[PDB]
Structure 1
Amino acid sequence: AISRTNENDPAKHGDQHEGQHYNISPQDLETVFPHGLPPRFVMQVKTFSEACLMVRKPALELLHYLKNTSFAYPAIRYLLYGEKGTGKTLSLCHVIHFCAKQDWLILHIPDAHLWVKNCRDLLQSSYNKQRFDQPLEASTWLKNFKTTNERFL
């Protein structure tokens, strides 16, 4: 299995694991990723009966940045960009899985495009009459946020 790596701990991946697939346990799948993974990667997980992510340079660089982050300075914005279907979503998922294992609090938005299109129950906020509420989109995210961060609640 030249394409697999036995190191299933994202905190110990480096340049020597590049191009190799590491396994995410079903517990980690259901806890860390109720909603994150791309729709067509969930089919592969269901068909292969295992979730495996390749270790790539973008994720390695973004993990090296997060390992040396100073928590006293203001939060740094990292933006993954690339051509269509290049793996940036799964790189973000790799980074989320790294952060979850170190008892970070995860605020994961799986797709912000869903909040700006195709909303059937749009309401007007009682808090601020000039804004609109999206109960179906907010309650769906709240359940998965509770699932991911149940310990800290």
Structure 2
Amino acid sequence: AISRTNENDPAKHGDQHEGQHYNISPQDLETVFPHGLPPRFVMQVKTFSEACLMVRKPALELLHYLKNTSFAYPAIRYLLYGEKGTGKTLSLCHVIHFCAKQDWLILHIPDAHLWVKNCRDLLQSSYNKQRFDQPLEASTWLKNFKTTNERFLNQIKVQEKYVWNKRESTEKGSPLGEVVEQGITRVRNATDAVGIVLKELKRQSSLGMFHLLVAVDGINALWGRTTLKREDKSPIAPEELALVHNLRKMMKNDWHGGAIVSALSQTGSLFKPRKAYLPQELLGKEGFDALDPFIPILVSNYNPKEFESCIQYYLENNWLQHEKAPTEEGKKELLFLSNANPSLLERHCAYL
């Protein structure tokens, strides 16, 4: 088992673990990642009966930054970028698993692209008649947010009276969980429940009640375009969506007591060419201006050690069933055909 590390605690991974797969327990999978993992990594987890993530230099660098983070200074924006299928989402997952173990409050958005396309039931927000609500997109997120942070929802207590309807209001000092519960029961108030949560999480984190991680995958969606239309077939802007408008406030570094970690993604983007991967091309002028200043972190293809370790993990799981895959010629052909790209390599190995 040269492709495995016995270190299952992400808070003690270092340069000596580069290229080695560490295991995430089922409890951590169901709590930390109800929604985080890529769709094709979840099938692997089901097939292998285990979730093992390789330790890579991007994640190690981002963990080194988060260990030496000053919680008095304003939150620092970290942006993971790289070519398609290089493993930036799974690096983000490594960092989220690190932060969840140290009792940070995790605000994880699995894919911000889903909020700007293919919404069937779009409403007009009563709080602000110029914005639109997405009850199914917001309630779906609230359930998994509650799942991840179920411990804190009772400790954290609201600081303002929130009036859902003339009959119903959340009183000052009530636990945040009630707000979350109100979003799950009545979907009409789901979108307004997300915003309130963010407003509280930004504020209380500043007081120092908890450390907050804002982990947004596919962040280039926020300052882009949408494919959502009005009834008169007119376009809708990303800032006209209440869910998108409230999530932009959490990308600004006007708060302390946490860090902002983000990952770009051309996959699922709107109006971007297939080969666009750099920060400015995907973000746009508006997005780059919003995130600037930020620390960009590059995710690349496997190096030879990483590639050999990935194939040894697959061989240890008996996932390469072709007789020539164990041989040297098979590995050289896999290397050429994927060019050490994690996603292409995994897809090729899926049917071998």
What band does the TM-score fall into relative to the shorter chain? over 0.9
- Measured in 1, the distance between the counterparts of 2:7 and 2:126 equals 51
- Output the CA distance in 2 between the equivalents of 1:39 and 1:97: 18
CA distance in 2, matches of 1:123, 1:106: 28
Deviation at 1:147, TM superposition (A): 0.0
Counterparts of 2:132 and 2:70, CA distance in 1: 37
Please report the TM-score for the alignment, with normalisation by the length of structure 1: 0.99
Following the alignment from structure 2 to structure 1, what is the Cα–Cα distance between the partners of residues 19 and 82?
A: 18
Cα offset for 1:133? 0.0
SS at match of 2:120: coil
Query: Which 4+ stretches in 1 moved above 6 angstroms?
Result: none
Matching residue of 1:139: 139
Distance in 2 separating the partners of 1:3 and 1:121? 47
- Residue identity over aligned pairs, in percent, reads 100
Following the alignment from structure 2 to structure 1, what is the Cα–Cα distance between the partners of residues 126 and 19?
51
Deviations 1:32-64 (A, max 9, x none): 000000000000000000000000000000000
Instruction: Name the SS of the counterpart of 1:113 in structure 2.
Output: helix
Alignment correspondent of 1:126: 126
CA offsets per residue over residues 103-132 of structure 1, 9 Å max, x none?
A: 000000000000000000100000000000
Aligned-residue offset at 1:92: 0.1
What SS is found at the alignment partner of 1:128?
Answer: coil
CA distance, structure 2, for counterparts of residue 135 and residue 97 of structure 1 = 28
Residue 47, structure 1, aligned to residue 47, structure 2: yes
State the shift of 1:87 in Å: 0.0
SS at match of 2:28: helix
Displacement of 1:90:
0.0
Q: Deviations over 1:122-148 (max 9, x none)?
A: 000000000000000000000000000
- Indicate the RMSD between aligned Cα atoms, in angstroms: 3.7
1:7-50 deviations in Å (ceiling 9; x for gaps): 00000000000000000000000000000000000000000000
Larger radius of gyration: 2
In the alignment, the residues of structure 2 paired with residue 140 and residue 125 of structure 1 have an alpha-carbon distance, to the nearest angstrom, of 18
Q: Secondary structure at the match of 1:119?
A: coil
More strand by share: 2
2: CA distance, partners of 1:98 / 1:112: 22
Please, which runs of 5 or more residues in structure 2 have no aligned partner? 153-351
TM superposition shift of 1:99: 0.1
1:91: Cα distance to partner? 0.0
Equivalents in 1 of 2:61, 2:106: separation in Å? 20
In structure 2, distance between residues paired with 1:21 and 1:92: 16
For 1:66 and 1:136, how far apart are their aligned partners in 2?
Answer: 33
Cα separation, 2, equivalents of 1:138 and 1:7? 36
| Cα distance between partner residues in 2 of 1:22 and 1:121 | 41
- Per the TM alignment, residue 101 of structure 1 is displaced from its structure 2 partner at its CA by 0.1
Task: Report the Cα distance in structure 2 between the residues aligned to 1:35 and 1:87, rounded to whole angstroms.
Answer: 16
Offset at residue 102 of structure 1 (A): 0.1
Q: State how many pairs are aligned.
A: 153
| Unaligned segments of structure 1, at least 5 residues | none
